[PDB]
């Protein structure tokens, strides 16, 4: 059930579209980069955003 | 009140089998001549095979174990496990 919510995918696409540059292919680094470039109210939401951000990075780096 | 019961399964185990509280001398000589020759001695086996009440069975077993003919393997709550040498 990783069917992730509209707000999560929305904020994730906004994050990658604004700041592609800081984000890398390392999940634990990208997690802390999300708290620097955004305001996330909760840690579960941080983890969900960062996971789908890394899964988008493994597509954008691909094609 | 009226006696109504919803199931009918009569004819129990064997219809109040009689059992001797005290061993006669013929039964005691039968003990002394073939209770060595059994392979495993429990009070249940001795009771159901020789028509003995279980307390009398435990009395006879604790007798002949004190003779040392029988060999104890273990004892616990409700099971008494025996053998004979050879």
């Amino acid at each position: 059930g990783r069917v992730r919510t509209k707000t999560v995918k929305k904020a994730a696409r906004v994050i990658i579209e604004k700041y592609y540059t800081r984000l890398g292919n390392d999940f634990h680094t990208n997690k802390r980069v999300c708290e620097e470039i955004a305001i996330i109210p909760s840690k579960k939401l941080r983890n969900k955003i960062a996971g789908y951000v890394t899964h988008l990075m493994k597509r954008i780096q691909r094609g | 009140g009226k006696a109504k019961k919803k199931k009918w399964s009569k004819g129990k185990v064997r219809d109040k089998l009689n059992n001797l509280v005290l061993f006669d001398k013929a039964t005691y000589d039968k003990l002394c001549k073939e209770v060595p020759n059994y392979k495993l001695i429990t009070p249940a086996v001795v009771s159901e095979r020789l028509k003995i009440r279980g307390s009398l069975a435990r009395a006879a077993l604790q007798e002949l174990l004190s003779k040392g003919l029988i060999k104890l393997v273990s004892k616990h709550r409700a099971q008494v496990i025996y053998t004979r040498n050879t």
Binding site: - | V13, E48, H76, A78, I81
Partner: protein
């Protein structure tokens, strides 16, 4: 460095005579341990039930019917008594004849409802070998329990009696009774 043994036992060279029950009986060396009572975590995944040792499975199916529910200390005591009975009776290590009773116990074909969405003929189908091990242990403990109900005999004596008369399937045991009864119904619905 020691050999992993149950009590006074070897717990070794127990050979399942056929295949179709290998890897569902955990009698092997990587799943042989001292006591049957282990940390039960065997409902997590479907097929990880196979890694339980069959002696623990025999204890688990032995504790039933409310009055005896729980009390794994009591049922491990029962198994400890029963192996001590089978050791004195004919030798031939009780783990081996337990495996032989499991083989010559559970049914190999049954009857069930199949489709076509009409009148159900109770069609004869096969059986999973996991379900053979399960139904084997269930029929063994059921026969032992309702044999030891209301007699001078004990759970230990009736359980050892049921295991020995199931490893020697001479039509006196309740496991061979329900074995033959299920195969006759399957042949009649064949």
């Amino acid at each position: 460095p020691d050999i992993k043994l149950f009590g006074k036992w070897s717990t070794d060279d127990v050979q399942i005579n056929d295949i179709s029950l290998q890897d569902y009986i955990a009698v092997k060396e990587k799943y042989a341990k001292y006591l049957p009572h282990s940390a039960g975590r065997y409902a997590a995944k479907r097929f990880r039930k196979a890694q339980c040792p069959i002696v623990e499975r025999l204890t688990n199916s032995m504790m039933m019917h409310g009055r005896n529910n729980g009390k794994k200390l009591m049922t491990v005591r029962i198994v400890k008594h029963a192996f001590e009975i089978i050791h004195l009776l004919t030798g031939e290590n009780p783990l081996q004849v337990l495996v032989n009773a499991i083989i010559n116990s559970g049914p190999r074909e049954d009857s069930t409802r199949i489709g076509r969405a009409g009148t159900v003929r109770r069609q004869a189908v096969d059986v999973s070998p996991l379900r053979r091990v399960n139904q084997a242990i269930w029929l063994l403990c059921t026969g032992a329990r309702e044999a030891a109900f209301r007699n001078i005999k004990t759970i230990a004596e009736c359980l050892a009696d049921e295991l020995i008369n199931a490893a020697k399937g001479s039509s006196n045991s309740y496991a061979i009774k329900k074995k033959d009864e299920l195969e006759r119904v399957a042949k009649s619905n064949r």
